[PDB]
Design a protein around this ligand. Structure first.
Ligand SMILES: Nc1nc2c(ncn2[C@@H]2O[C@H](COP(=O)(O)OP(=O)(O)NP(=O)(O)O)[C@@H](O)[C@H]2O)c(=O)[nH]1
Ligand SMILES: Nc1nc2c(ncn2[C@@H]2O[C@H](COP(=O)(O)OP(=O)(O)NP(=O)(O)O)[C@@H](O)[C@H]2O)c(=O)[nH]1
Ligand SMILES: [Mg+2]
Ligand SMILES: [Mg+2]
Lengths: 166, 166
């Protein structure tokens, strides 16, 4: 069956994991639990096609440096997450994008920008700001809550759909 | 606020209306009720942006001929629906696409192809067939059920998102 090798990337603490566990296990994780690397495989149906979601959950910062090159060479599509109440995670998006273009020999790589935690009142990252960025990158933007589950399927399925169209 | 002038197009009986009423009124309409033309306006939030969904629901066939040119000149994005158990509605998609390119002076117009009624066992339109078509048009494809509500938000929001990116 078609397999879609997806990897979830972004700054430490932004909800990369809580977002992947909502998809696979249908529940919010409200725990302190920093990822070294996790992987999730799931037979799923998206728009009538039977496919396996092969997802890599990654680390926020760590000695993950050129340690990242290896999985960014193997991922087919990227979820690039920041938190809407953490301005420096929004800003670090440029570093993750460029390194993925660098190891990919590509300016067009399947990707979607995700502003997570849209449930929290108190954002510092305005959606206009983030949607303008997603437009400059030629990237769709989708806000999410791992807490509420708002948009989580929508972010993962839009990315499976960026990969169908490339 | 941003307004997104969307119109729902396709063959008679395919679920264009049931799909629009699930979005606006949160309920399945399981009635025989052929549209001349209906319009729905709704203040909604999509990915943090406050916007009005101005949707035009249209007729399947009728004396709607160059009678369509007028609204296809005014719609910003199109939802192109067929039914997955009705081969000729899948086939009539080419006629709706081309006329929209014709009155639009455009090869790239925001659009998504929707195979509706994915709940019914007994399809005659295979998702590979329809996803290949959506790929040839440079269009995303999303299956839906107005009955179940599966994918309805997903089809309407992906189209609002095609319009953000154009
Ligand atoms: N309210 C709110 N909190 C969330 C959301 N997503 C995650 N959290 C919280 O944010 C914190 C970090 O979540 P986690 O998934 O561990 O983030 P991470 O990006 O995977 N951290 P890391 O880079 O170290 O692996 C946790 O307290 C989690 O409950 C969200 O949608 N909203
Ligand atoms: N089981 C199933 N039936 C559906 C679905 N969508 C619509 N229907 C049924 O299909 C029939 C037509 O629905 P309707 O919304 O009126 O279609 P239309 O495309 O708007 N007809 P028209 O072109 O004349 O205006 C109705 O019986 C409706 O309940 C769906 O998701 N699945
Ligand atoms: Mg984690
Ligand atoms: Mg109708």
């Amino acid at each position: 069956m078609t397999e879609y090798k997806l990897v979830v990337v972004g700054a430490g603490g932004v909800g990369k994991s809580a977002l992947t566990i909502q998809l696979i296990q249908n529940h919010f994780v409200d725990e302190y639990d920093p990822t070294i690397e996790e992987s999730y495989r799931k037979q799923v149906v998206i728009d009538g096609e039977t496919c396996l979601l092969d997802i890599l959950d990654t680390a926020g910062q760590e000695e993950y440096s050129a340690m990242r090159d290896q999985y960014m060479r193997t991922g087919e599509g990227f979820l690039c997450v920041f938190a809407i109440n953490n301005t420096k995670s929004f800003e670090d998006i440029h570093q993750y994008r460029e390194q993925i273009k660098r190891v990919k020999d590509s300016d067009d790589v399947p990707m979607v920008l995700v502003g997570n935690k849209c449930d929290l009142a108190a954002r510092t990252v305005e959606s206009r700001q983030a949607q303008d960025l997603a437009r400059s990158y030629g990237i769709p933007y989708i806000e999410t809550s791992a807490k509420t589950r708002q948009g989580v399927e929508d972010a993962f399925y839009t990315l499976v759909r960026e990969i169908r169209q490339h």
